[PDB]
């Protein structure tokens, strides 16, 4: 029949599920003492992401720790509340699942599914670049994820290989919703990663979901070339390159890839793919995606081009090593009012 009507039906039901959780968020579903801390998997501005073991079940999880005082100093209160409120309400095959959340006197905690394959960033840098079919397999998953998120009035705002984990089946799990926002109109916050910013963000204009479509163009280029389309030693030089209106493609890029990338890395919003009358369909029906079976991808039926090595449960060999700082919980509650809804 029409795949678009099945898509509409699917999205309508997903919105109903989302709104119930969006309106009544899960809160205080575990405690720190229920987890044994094993190893730091990564760090952020507010703290570490640690591999943990849930003692009652023996399950491994990734626990994100955010120091409330550091969130406040960085003026990230609202963004932190958006992050947990959004992540607890979403549900899609390529979005990392939030299993528990809670807080104590010092910190906020988000306990998520542990994705052991490591960041796409690690594999991309080591290998050098991904072949076109390899990059297309990952790109298809972001296209579907964005179609889902945007239907919920969500903007993701931080697409990059660092934020994409590879699961045991070789599929993507998107993490890091620190800048995600539920917004119907236009928004103005200067946020994201320099190499991935759309021109409208750099130029301090009101922007919308089209910034995630521009960031998809940067991701595809990076995966297929091994380097971003706009790079320099400092962010200001990156911004000058982004606003210039010029992109150079490697000679090995197929004609179809370049065409898709010119329509994604498009300064003109009345011309950027994902932003027109046909919406996501301009991307899904592009020639570069002709061999992509969208349903088979969503159903996880497609054989992945790369399966990460798995030594066993709790193995962290696909992640870099980090300095370990022991968690401290103050005897006094910090920033209680600011994080009341968490």
């Amino acid at each position: 029949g029409s795949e678009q009507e099945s898509v509409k039906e699917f999205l309508a039901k997903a919105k109903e599920d989302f709104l119930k959780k969006w309106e009544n968020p899960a809160q205080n579903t575990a405690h720190l003492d229920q987890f044994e801390r094993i190893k730091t998997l990564g760090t952020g501005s507010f703290g570490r992401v640690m591999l943990v073991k849930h003692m009652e079940t023996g399950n491994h999880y990734a626990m994100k720790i955010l120091d409330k005082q550091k969130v406040v100093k960085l003026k990230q209160i609202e963004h932190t509340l958006n992050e947990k409120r959004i992540l607890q309400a979403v549900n899609f095959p390529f979005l990392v699942k939030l299993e528990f959340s809670f807080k104590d006197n010092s910190n906020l905690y988000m306990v998520m599914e542990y994705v052991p394959g490591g960041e796409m960033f690690s594999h991309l840098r080591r290998i050098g670049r991904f072949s076109e079919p390899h990059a297309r397999f990952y790109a298809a998953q972001i296209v579907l994820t964005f179609e889902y998120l945007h239907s919920l009035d969500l903007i993701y705002r931080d697409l990059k290989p660092e934020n994409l984990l590879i699961d045991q089946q070789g599929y993507i799990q998107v993490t890091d919703f620190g800048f995600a926002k539920r917004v119907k109109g236009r928004t103005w916050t200067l946020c994201g990663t320099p190499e991935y910013l759309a021109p409208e963000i750099i130029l301090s204009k009101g922007y919308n979901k089209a910034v995630d479509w521009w960031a998809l163009g940067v991701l595809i280029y990076e995966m297929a070339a091994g380097y971003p389309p706009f790079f320099a030693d400092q962010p200001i030089q990156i911004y000058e390159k982004i606003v210039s209106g010029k992109v150079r493609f490697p000679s090995h890029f197929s004609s179809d890839l370049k065409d898709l990338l010119r329509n994604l890395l498009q300064v003109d919003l009345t011309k950027r793919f994902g932003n027109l009358k046909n919406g996501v369909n301009d991307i899904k029906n592009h020639k570069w995606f002709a061999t992509t079976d969208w349903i088979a991808i969503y159903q996880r039926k497609v054989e992945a081009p790369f399966i990460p090595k798995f030594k066993g449960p709790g193995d962290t060999s696909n992640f870099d090593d980090y300095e370990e700082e022991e968690i401290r919980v103050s005897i006094n509650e910090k920033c209680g009012k600011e994080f009341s809804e968490f």
Binding site: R125, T193, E195, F231
Partner: peptide, 18 residues
């Protein structure tokens, strides 16, 4: 080459958000 220019740049490591 552009690859050599990228590899010699200070931005091949993990990138932080603004």
């Amino acid at each position: 080459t552009t690859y050599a220019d990228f590899i010699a740049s200070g931005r091949t490591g993990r990138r932080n958000a603004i």
